[PDB]
Design a protein around this ligand. Structure first.
Ligand SMILES: N=C(NO)NCCC[C@H](N)C(=O)O
Ligand SMILES: N=C(NO)NCCC[C@H](N)C(=O)O
Ligand SMILES: N=C(NO)NCCC[C@H](N)C(=O)O
Ligand SMILES: [Mn+2]
Ligand SMILES: [Mn+2]
Ligand SMILES: [Mn+2]
Ligand SMILES: [Mn+2]
Ligand SMILES: [Mn+2]
Ligand SMILES: [Mn+2]
Lengths: 314, 314, 314
């Protein structure tokens, strides 16, 4: 199989700066090469340079709208672009609002996809709900159909087309959800697994379930949008919003691991890494490798080992 | 429902000083207000000032007896006092020996209550057993009937009336139990779940069980005496006795969470917080919020979110 | 029952020095006395002084061969020596290559034994595979029959006799396995439980299984070769190779605990402790006690308590 990496050095989805340095640190952590070490061919597409929207106005509360609308428009494009060639898209990112882009682009070639969302937050707030115009906390509200026309069309996201219903999305790692968001997920009946569910079933069953629930009938392609923050802060400290009591490195590596073991991975998102939001240099480095590690997980590497087949190591 | 908070700034139950600063730090962490943010009405009762017993003699080995006898006598009173009005009692505390007070006061209005004891220790030692007169390690021995007249009446605890048998008490998080104590719990057949049990079943099943075992037949009121030290030291470092390999923040939040989801909470104890026993300021702060967090847990807050009902956030 | 402790202050199995100081720190942590506190009689055998092999040549890639061959020859001997008297052998160690010695010596008296291997690594590499002559990463390859004559006889391990097949060995905690090693374990069909398996089943089921798989038919003696490094680095930092995302103190204490509860413990290995590889003095101390703790676990101590029988603590 083939792998193409897209860098989404962006950050207007939120205030704290650095997230665009995300793909910059990830490649520096040698993400590309290690990936090559697998059975997958890897092509690095570089960093989609994003033209800045002069005089971007705050649509009511929502900020830097046009920016996030055009930046995400440019991305979805490249994604659908690769997706058609048949390669697996892996979006190194800045804030998690590049999810619309990625996800959209993906749905163009595979409109039957599901979505596993590992984030501490649902990020399912709308321009109406959000107590901030930080679109990095709305990505699902743009991709959801059951939410279309449920809020004033936003300046820059015209090209966006609600592509999936709540019956194809699955959240894992939720532990910091806003009122409005809780409403939405309950109302629209969205299958999720808050830390409390993790706690109850155990990552194993959590994954086991989520799968049947999504690939029970028709096996479709998967889009794992992973938010480096959905792990506990002790593991991925260099982030925008940390939230104690989250997924463990182990649990996180278990997810990408069961994901891989299903061969249905199509699109991958490694968002929210802020190479600057480090209390200490280590914390960053930590955050960086664990992230890196989580990628190579989705692409083969098992915690039990790997050995090139047909070769007699004896 | 209504909530009344009682501060038990005390510490003679043990040597290390600071535990009385407990309710002092907890309120400072804004425990009161956050609580108001729920569906419960909250009334802060303040800190029961405790008159000191001049010349308190060490009953054999047991120390500061009269102190702990009168301090706990004053408390039980206020507790039964609120309990009658129908509000939920929440005892911010100093050492865990204010459990007799709280628990007693509670049993006066609801003598059919059970008790969930999250502590690293059983604290079920008697004046006979204890290798210390630290009554913060005997609270159950005073409340237990099967232990009445099993030791020399203690100077100051006359007013104390063994209120519950081993069939209504449940320990969770035990990992540092003394010989004598092991004897007692086995002999008197006390349902418990040592870390090893936690390890085996998984907090989920651990709670699931404990409930049936207590609320299987007659659903009664619950008295969760939570000992901030039953969590692992990495989570609640600012304590008297830390004991590695204990409950995780997650597991601890899972408990208070399943407790809440049963609407049977009547009395709550947040003991053993020593705002001074911090290797570093953070450790305290850590200890403080996690504690605070554990309270608001027992009162609604879920790790999946909360949203005021009947309001359309759309 | 009787316990005899053997100190294997050795380290040529690998580069980093200090591991021979292993038994030196363990006794200093009072391992001997605490052990006496159990229902087992304990005899400390002291530290097998190891005569150094002048001019030890690097068999191709493999280093300090003759050293590790004679040091392990001297050990197996003492082990079989005690094993015959009926006492339980407990090898405090230096690098994990003293496993051949221990294990061999054990098989002499009980050739029907199985083996539980808690290590981050399989250490099942051969002189052919290893990208290092560090025999501390080959111990199983010398003890395995299915591997005999699968590599050039090594200078110093003549006396070694492949004693067990892959049907009697069980690995727990694997998370850093080399290519060649993966080949071997898959090929030779070796029952294991990588962190991912731990993650899936939960230490409880992991142990529950491993047992039936080994003691299902004929109950035999157990040889728990525990590698202090198989726990997460946060717990046992003072080691040669740390590997993030490993067994928790709890999970590790759960293992030795279920091991003990089967009364089938015959030989115990507490390897890879490097009293010098400590970022800070605490880290060592940490590493030391947790190790110590893991021993006393295999010998009675439960996390629920212990009380001398036939004594009325009332
Ligand atoms: N980028 C993230 N998470 O990864 N943002 C979470 C934001 C929380 C909430 N949804 C908001 O819009 O404020
Ligand atoms: N306050 C506590 N735990 O929260 N004390 C535990 C004391 C251990 C033991 N029961 C003793 O009396 O020494
Ligand atoms: N001592 C240990 N683990 O405890 N060594 C692991 C070494 C990793 C690998 N088997 C090698 O030979 O390099
Ligand atoms: Mn997000
Ligand atoms: Mn997030
Ligand atoms: Mn206590
Ligand atoms: Mn305690
Ligand atoms: Mn080893
Ligand atoms: Mn190892």
């Amino acid at each position: 199989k083939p792998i193409e990496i897209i860098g989404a050095p962006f950050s207007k989805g939120q205030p704290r700066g650095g997230v665009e340095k995300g793909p910059a640190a990830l490649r520096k952590a040698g993400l590309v090469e290690k990936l090559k070490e697998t059975e997958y061919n890897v092509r690095d597409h570089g960093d989609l340079a994003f033209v800045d929207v002069p005089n971007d106005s705050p649509f009511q509360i929502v900020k830097n709208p046009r920016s996030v609308g055009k930046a995400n428009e440019q991305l979805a494009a490249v994604v659908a672009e690769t997706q058609k060639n048949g390669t697996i898209s892996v979006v190194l990112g800045g804030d998690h609002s590049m999810a619309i882009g990625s996800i959209s682009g993906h749905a163009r070639v595979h409109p039957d996809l599901c979505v596993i969302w590992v984030d501490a937050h649902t990020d399912i707030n709308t321009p109406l709900t959000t107590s901030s115009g930080n679109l990095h906390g709305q990505p699902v509200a743009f991709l959801l159909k059951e939410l279309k026309g449920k809020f004033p069309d936003v300046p820059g996201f015209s090209w966006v087309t609600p592509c999936i219903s709540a019956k194809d999305i699955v959240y894992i790692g939720l532990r910091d959800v806003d009122p409005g968001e809780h409403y939405i997920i309950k109302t629209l009946g969205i299958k999720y697994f808050s830390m409390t569910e993790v706690d109850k079933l155990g990552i194993g069953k959590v994954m086991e379930e989520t799968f049947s629930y999504l690939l029970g009938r028709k096996k479709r392609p998967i889009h794992l949008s992973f938010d480096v923050d959905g792990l506990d802060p002790v593991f991925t400290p260099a982030t925008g919003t940390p939230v104690v009591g989250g997924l463990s490195y182990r649990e996180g590596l278990y997810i990408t691991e069961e994901i891989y073991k299903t061969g249905l991975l199509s699109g991958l998102d490694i968002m929210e890494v802020n190479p600057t939001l480090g209390k200490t240099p280590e914390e960053v480095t930590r955050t960086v490798n664990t992230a890196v590690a989580l990628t190579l997980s989705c692409f083969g590497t098992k915690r039990e080992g790997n050995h090139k087949p047909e070769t007699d190591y004896l």
